[PDB]
Amino acid sequence: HPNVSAPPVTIEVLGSSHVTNSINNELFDPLISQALSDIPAITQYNMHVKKGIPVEDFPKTGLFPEPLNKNFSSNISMPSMDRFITESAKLRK
Amino acid sequence: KSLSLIAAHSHITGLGLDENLQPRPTSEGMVGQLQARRAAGVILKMVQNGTIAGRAVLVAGPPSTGKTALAMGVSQSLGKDVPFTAIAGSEIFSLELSKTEALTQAFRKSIGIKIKEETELIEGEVVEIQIDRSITGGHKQGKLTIKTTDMETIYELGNKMIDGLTKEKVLAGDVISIDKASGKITKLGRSFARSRFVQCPEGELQKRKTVVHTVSLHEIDVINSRTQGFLALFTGDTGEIRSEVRDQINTKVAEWKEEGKAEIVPGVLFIDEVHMLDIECFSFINRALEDEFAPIVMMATNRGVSKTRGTNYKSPHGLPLDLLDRSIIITTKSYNEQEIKTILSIRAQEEEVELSSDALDLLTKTGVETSLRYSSNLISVAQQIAMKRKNNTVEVEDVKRAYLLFLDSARSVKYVQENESQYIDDQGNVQISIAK
Amino acid sequence: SLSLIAAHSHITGLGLDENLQPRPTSEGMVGQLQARRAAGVILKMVQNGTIAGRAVLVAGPPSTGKTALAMGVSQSLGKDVPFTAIAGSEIFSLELSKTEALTQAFRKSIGIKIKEETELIEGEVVEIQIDRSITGGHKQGKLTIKTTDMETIYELGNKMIDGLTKEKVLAGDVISIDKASGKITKLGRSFARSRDYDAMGADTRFVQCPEGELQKRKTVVHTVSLHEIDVINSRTQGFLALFTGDTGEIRSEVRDQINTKVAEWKEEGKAEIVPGVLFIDEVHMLDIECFSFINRALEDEFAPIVMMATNRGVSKTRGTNYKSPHGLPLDLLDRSIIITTKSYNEQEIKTILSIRAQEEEVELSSDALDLLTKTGVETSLRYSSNLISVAQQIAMKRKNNTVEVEDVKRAYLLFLDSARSVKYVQENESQYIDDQGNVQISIAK
Amino acid sequence: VTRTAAHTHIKGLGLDESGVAKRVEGGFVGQIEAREACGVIVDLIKAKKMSGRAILLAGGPSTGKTALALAISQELGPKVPFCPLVGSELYSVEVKKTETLMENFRRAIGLRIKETKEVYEGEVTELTPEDAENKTISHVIVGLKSAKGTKTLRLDPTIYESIQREKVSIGDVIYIEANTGAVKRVGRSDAYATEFDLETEEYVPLPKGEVHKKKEIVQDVTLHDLDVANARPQGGQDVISMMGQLLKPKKTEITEKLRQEVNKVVAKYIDQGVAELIPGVLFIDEVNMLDIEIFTYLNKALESNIAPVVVLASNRGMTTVRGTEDVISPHGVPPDLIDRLLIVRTLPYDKDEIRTIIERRATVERLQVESSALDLLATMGTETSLRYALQLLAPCGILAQTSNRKEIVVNDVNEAKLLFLDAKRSTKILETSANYL
Amino acid sequence: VTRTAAHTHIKGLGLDESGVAKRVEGGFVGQIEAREACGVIVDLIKAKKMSGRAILLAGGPSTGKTALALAISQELGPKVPFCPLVGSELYSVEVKKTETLMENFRRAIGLRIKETKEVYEGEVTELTPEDAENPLGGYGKTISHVIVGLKSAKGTKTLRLDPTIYESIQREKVSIGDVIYIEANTGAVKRVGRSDAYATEFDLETEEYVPLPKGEVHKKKEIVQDVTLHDLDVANARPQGGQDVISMMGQLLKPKKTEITEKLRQEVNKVVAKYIDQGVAELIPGVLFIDEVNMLDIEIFTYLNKALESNIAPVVVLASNRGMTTVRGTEDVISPHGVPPDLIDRLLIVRTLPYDKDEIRTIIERRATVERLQVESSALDLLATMGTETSLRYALQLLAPCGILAQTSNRKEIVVNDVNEAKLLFLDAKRSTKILETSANYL
Amino acid sequence: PFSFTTFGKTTSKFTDLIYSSRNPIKYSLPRLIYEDLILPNYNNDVDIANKLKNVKFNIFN
Ligand SMILES: Nc1ncnc2c1ncn2[C@@H]1O[C@H](COP(=O)(O)OP(=O)(O)O)[C@@H](O)[C@H]1O
Ligand SMILES: Nc1ncnc2c1ncn2[C@@H]1O[C@H](COP(=O)(O)OP(=O)(O)O)[C@@H](O)[C@H]1O
Ligand SMILES: Nc1ncnc2c1ncn2[C@@H]1O[C@H](COP(=O)(O)OP(=O)(O)O)[C@@H](O)[C@H]1O
Ligand SMILES: Nc1ncnc2c1ncn2[C@@H]1O[C@H](COP(=O)(O)OP(=O)(O)O)[C@@H](O)[C@H]1O
């Protein structure tokens, strides 16, 4: 896992809401954010059946690449109870 | 302050000069080199005047004579918000940038644009926050009671203030700052509530704050290049910025100076070991010094009548004569016993090394026979030897032990030449066997 | 309209007869009768189109007209025939190897002619009435396309409606639809429906409403080079690499598949191979690897006729350490035929100078033409050709229309040739930077 | 207070209406023959007829080749394109050197396009979108208002899409360009500044002028600008992106097909009278740094129909050409290229015009120099070099100013000569000393 | 049992409390003055005060320079960052060599930070999104908020997530009944796995089953983290960890070294100095070791001259076998140890002497005991004579074939016949060169 | 990993969680550069030149 995880460098411009709007539209662009994610299934049922939106006019989703495992999905590692036994040779024996 | 351990030029706080540009014998961590320091003060006044553009100076001399010390003194006496770009000669041989493009970036990192602007800020200590939620949540209302040491007020918040205060969670007792136009809330910290800790700010909320920005021309070149974001200012993958962007930036900067909305701050581009550039970089420097938006270039070299890189002939200082025609040369000289002793005493005083007078005399004799840098390196290891014996003062025997344990250049050369069979020579021959 | 008067703009082709015999002065080409006859033989072989991969080396001293002969061949070749004129220095690149750059230069010089028939309905849209189907399949539409003269109603299918909703066409938009293939375009908005909106959009283009017949028949002849097909089939969206140039070392199997498909499209008759000429100017500036790849690449049936130009004598081949005639190895000269260009006498210099002065609209006097001819015989053709225009500007600064002897003498005094500059440098060698870098900027000692 | 560069004092070639160079005019003194030759060259450029003409300025160092090149640049004017370049700049690590040379060739051919700029500025009073389905909006009625009155506009759904992109509501001062279609939200008006006591809205004033403002502008582009405009491996130059794209675009070898298509489009626009073609100057200082391959491609590219006027500078003599081994050629330029050049010889100076150069540089930098100090500076310029005196002019002024004098005295010149060394004295110190100076 | 290498037998410098060196301790034999100088350097590093101090280990081949560098690294401990390097490793095809040298300079400087993490951990009980009223506007997303219920041990609370945090949730494929772990510092979500409150014998995806997390939801936990300055530089140069689309697409791009600018390094230094001034992090300077420093060319030495003068540069130790050798990348610059005199003036040369017969004998004995081999005294004496005759490394590397030949003949001891057979089977460099000189068809 | 972040942290019916991570490194840009070189303005020409280079002189028009 990496040692340091960092967001991009935030650019601040004092006294301008246009900079904040453009930065929020760039970092959180809804097309790219929707492409790297998925709509919830009950939400898809609500747009398709309840709201009558065809599936061809849905936003494109599910384009994020799959990881190797569930272990490779995130960099956070939980303290394993089975590891705790083998951390001490006295306790393992 | 920032991150600073004790370095080679930490004791130099600038140029020890008077109001008449006369160098004191010992001032601001610099001793000796009176003509070199006066010439550096003249160059510093050329930078501080700001009316002279594209002057190349060459600091030339023997090694360990203070060329980089002179450049550090100029940089320390320059002050803040004046761009000092110090690079080595090998830094511009890049794999993703051409050498002329890297030289252009180094040239334009040393010219700044000074813009002053006003911002309305609300910096205060939060008394309380109330927010009354709706039945469903379509509309949110709230009151923010804030105070300072002088004032105390209540604000009727809108929806966007409520969303920007719930995000970046502000409780009672927090000193915060709000920019009203950009909608940015910065938590300066917890106030003096006993229950980090920052004092309650002074009164007159919603104050005008004047911010003075110095932005280098390279940053505006990266910004105006629409294929380059400003993250390339940190990642470094600017990747050969086109010339037309630089022409638009030059015309915009000239019209900003004419309109009075901005000022131009010239700076210093220092090139340590300038002999390591090749001849095409020297030609590019020869043409690029003629620009109006060009800084003053200090170059340091120690080579004497050396072969110019990229060519097959030899030139003085490793530099061709068309470059030396465009430059005025500052010559640094060697040090005598007293200047070496004063430099060693200053270096010992900086590193909190208490040493005796005869130890200082022995270190001065070593730095006269061998080199100033060898004795200045020997000071710290002699101090470590001194505290190994639980002694707080460096004696003569500590310097003798440090001289015995760590060798200089001439002793290493002599010990290699006496036992040249044990080392690997130019032909790759070595006798690793010790017998027969 | 954009082209200015260049160094070879006066040449409209080889000045030959129907018997391949060169005229003394025709189509801007003067002299070089053996070279022009040989180049006419070369042109016929390209026009025959039945043999492939001949290497022709145009050799001679500089300023004799090797590149002039190549431009004469290219002008006599006519349009829609691939002529690729490249220099030898363009092969050395950074993301393409030398053999790959040579392959792209070879396959850019041979193409295929393809005939297309278009039934174009071009007009402004008045109304699109959509018959909304209950099941949604086969959505019928009524297109009211309209010219200046007359207007019909067209029936529209479901994929037609999907194409007309993929791009945003409304009433008052000028579109043309192909009947045979169903191609869709949007030329923009008509000028009659242009004043209805106070501000135009980002992609809004204003075009004139077409007149005449609503549906027109047209036959379009497309000349597509083999390199174009390689770049198209190399990538998913390969047409951008045809213009940006980042093709990036197209693999071999694409090229064999495209060659076999070109052969079968030829044998079923929907395309015909048009060979052309690849002209490498200054071919001595190539590596020995490039020469070996040229030697093997000339033996393919999809290979153009290669004309190479060299002004070198017995010079060192690049990439090796030995000298060779023309700067070319002996196995390359083995698979080649050499056209030799000779120097010009006084009459040919005078005729070429008069033609170049007539091309630049400069009225030369007879004594000025004689002085320029004497300078051309003494120094060089190109020096007098460059002197003509600056003498014209000198005479125009003197409020004169034609040039005289004094204008040519002033241009000779102001601008130096090679020999005079060599003499001035050799007389004062301390003032210039030597090969060892030494110079004397100081004027006194 | 304006800064002073090395070529600030030169404003032109200093010629009269007959082309004869006045001796001291336009920041020049002496060098009359090369100035007259450069005047003939700029007359040839102003004729706007020739293509691929090449002139080489050959002379010693500190003689005024670059001075004559910038004098040509001021004589032509800012309308004519001028591309200054070094021979070292063609060696790029992203694209090949012939492509860089051809890009700099296309950078020196410009276009003037007359255009209109029409701007609607002010606060939105009404924003009513009319749908008229055939879900999809037909148009939008937008009412802008400034201090001189209000104005109503009908806008297409593309501008409505751009308006809803900017989060424009009722009461926001916005900016609309009628020709481009760009929508920029300036911010909320102060008439709605007291709806809440604290909110993230930026409250800007109402525009004092009219809502609709129209003016005439001229666009000065180059052929290289139009080349790189439609040759992008990753497109999207239209969208405003402060942050960079995820994949860095690299310089690529632009094919001749794009050049011919751009030329066809430009010729079609010129034939309509919209655009005007301005041939310009590509100046290459230190042309001896060019590789022999770049010289060969220069030989090929000087015969193009759209090539500009190329001005080369060199200070070498009988020198080996770069990239070769035994080609001794004048000025480091191979003899095949030299046959296509016109050579302008640049002469050295003597004491009197060196003195006038020194006094002109002193007058431009606003320094008062005494007459005997000027004579000492001229003698030092004849002894060491001219640029040594020209670069020691400003330390003399600083040493005079630190002694509270506005006049440079002889003692200031002696002090500046003592503090700063020329090349010859430093070479003598280098030769006499042993341990690396 | 244990796998051994060339420097396994060395546990440290092996000095007294006064800095003097015992002759045979710490896995070291001889080199008393070199070990004492290395101990003085180790104390200088432990002072944590100086910057850019540089020494040079000079000596012949097989004299123990890398042994002394490993002893310095072992005596400093695992907390002090030690960066071993070869002079050939700085030549990278992705980025310039000076950037690689600066990256290793920042890699040798360490930082120990206490970090407070705000954590929402627990088992997902309900996960219901609230849909947007206009899903196809193109400006928002299909949902507005997501209500998620989490229960820990003795605690239950519900969270209203914005669509970014829910996107981070659903990219971990979080369903009902999953114990999860949301880190509020970055928005990163860890799916711990299925809760053991339900049946755990009916899954097919080899999942782990975890209990409910102890304590309340929304904890604040303190973690001690050891990073380097290069880690911060490469994290800020290539941003990953945020939930914005730039961080997420930069996760998926191919990693590539870039020329990290001085502006980013100065900003990282400012943030680290702010962390120190709040008393939450401490700076641990370390060692950059460059073995075979002769492989560097003149440009890396020139950049080293500038980089050693920085106020953040680590302690740099170098090794070289060369004598009076020309510097790489130059033509006529003859210099000691292949290091130019501009860098030699900034150095402190530590000499290393060759060994005697008895020192070689006890080095062979210690290498035999660390490899679990039994050698007879006569065979040990023959190994010592072979080491003095051919080379020390040839005598050390012949011990394992001797053990193989001993265990082949069902013996635990190494007899003289075994070392004679290993001498016959395997050749040193001198005998191989003598075969090369007396052969025809280029052996 | 060590989170190089500044975010909304509690100093100490539902409680909402909003993504609020920011880099500690802040780049300050003046309003003049953004409003005169990037944004369209009446005295600027970025929209006109952008339409001229991207639409009017596009070779795929
Ligand atoms: N005049 C001086 N005053 C104070 N310190 C000096 C002086 N000259 C040199 N030094 C110190 O000596 C050390 C080596 O000098 P340096 O600047 O490296 O000279 P050079 O760059 O010419 O080799 C530096 O750490 C510098 O601080
Ligand atoms: N036969 C010819 N007829 C007309 N012009 C010629 C002829 N030969 C040469 N020229 C002129 O001489 C100039 C230089 O000739 P060029 O084609 O460059 O010869 P080379 O390629 O051998 O150097 C050209 O600009 C061309 O106009
Ligand atoms: N004839 C002249 N009159 C006035 N100033 C001159 C003249 N010639 C040269 N200079 C000045 O001398 C300086 C150096 O000359 P420059 O053109 O750089 O030499 P080079 O031709 O070697 O490039 C320039 O700043 C220029 O202003
Ligand atoms: N003083 C010593 N005591 C014990 N073993 C040593 C000693 N010096 C060297 N060695 C051994 O000799 C071998 C060669 O040492 P090394 O430092 O790798 O070579 P070099 O000195 O040429 O860099 C190492 O495996 C090491 O274990």
Author numbering:
A (entry chain Q): 1211 to 1303
B (entry chain Y): 15 to 209, 220 to 460
C (entry chain U): 16 to 460
D (entry chain T): 21 to 154, 161 to 463
E (entry chain X): 21 to 463
F (entry chain Q): 1025 to 1036, 1069 to 1117
From the paper:
To assess whether the nucleotide state affected the location of the Arp8 module, we determined structures of S.c INO80 on 0/80 and 0/40 nucleosomes in the presence of a non-hydrolysable ATP analog (ADP/BeFx). The overall structure of INO80 bound to 0/80 nucleosomes in the presence of ADP/BeFx is similar to the previously published structure in the apo state. The INO80 C-module is well resolved at a resolution of 2.8 Å. The Arp8 module is resolved as a well-defined density on the flanking DNA (~40 bp). Although at a lower resolution (~11.2 Å), we can dock the previously published atomic model of the S.c Arp8 module bound to the HSA region of the ATPase into this density. For X.l nucleosomes, no difference is observed between the previously published structure in the apo state and the structure determined here in the presence of ADP/BeFx, suggesting that the nucleotide state does not influence the Arp8 module’s conformation on X.l nucleosomes. We further find that for the INO80: X.l 0/80 (ADP/BeFx) sample, a majority of the particles have clear or partial density for the Arp8 module on flanking DNA (classes 2a and 2b) and a small proportion do not show density for the Arp8 module (class 3). In contrast, on 0/80 nucleosomes, where the Arp8 module engages the flanking DNA, this location of the Arp8 module potentially represents a sliding-competent state of INO80.
However, amongst these remodelers, the INO80 chromatin remodeler appears largely sufficient to generate the well positioned +1 and −1 nucleosomes. S.c INO80 is a multi-subunit complex consisting of 15 subunits that are divided into three different modules. The catalytic module with the Ino80 (ATPase) RecA lobes and insert, Arp5, Ies6, Ies2, Rvb1 and Rvb2, constitutes the core unit of INO80 (C-module). INO80 slides nucleosomes with 40 bp of flanking DNA ~100-fold slower than nucleosomes with 80 bp of flanking DNA, displaying a switch like response to flanking DNA length.
